Amino acid sequence: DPKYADLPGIARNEPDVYETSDLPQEELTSTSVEHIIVNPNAAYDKFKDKRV
């Protein structure tokens, strides 16, 4: 604390931080109807030579 000695204004005991006390979907399973699955690779395999 070099500069601090020259400071006539010094008083301790309180920190310099602001921190007090600390204290730390049906569109998926719709039973209404039926849906599809992802299956990317096998879908392309399913649609392998289904070109023009």
């Binding site: 649609f47 030579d49 289904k50 070109r51 023009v52």
Partner: protein, 182 residues
Amino acid sequence: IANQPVVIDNGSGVIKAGFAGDQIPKYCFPNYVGRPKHVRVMAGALEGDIFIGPKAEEHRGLLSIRYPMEHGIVKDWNDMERIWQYVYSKDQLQTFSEEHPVLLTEAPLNPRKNRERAAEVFFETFNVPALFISMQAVLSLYATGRTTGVVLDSGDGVTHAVPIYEGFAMPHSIMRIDIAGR
């Protein structure tokens, strides 16, 4: 091939045919073509653009119907060619033109040119060894078994009453109007 040929019945609306020696025409289907009308968006879908048979009787509102025979007279001869090719199919014939002494029918009172053109097809194009075509009433004489009769046959687009005697009808006692429930 010297085996079972095919008996082919006409019909302006429904054509019939079947392997000989049986009692039912093995394959019967209507006389038109079904060709769709929409953009082939998804590739690899139903393509071929010309349907006859199960897809025709399946994809009803998905095609474009076109009858090639009218009043028992074919004018869209190429469409009937393709219909014959549908008969030649593996679903139906699995044969070649050069394999049987096939049979075919034809109602009377017609210009010979129709039969001529058909002969040109089945003989110049198709290499059919023998293709006979007869009337459409001796067939019924065989069915009834009697010799003296008055044969009436309510066609797909024709009506004709003819009295025959032992398979010999008068070449004048012939009555016909090309009409049906169409």
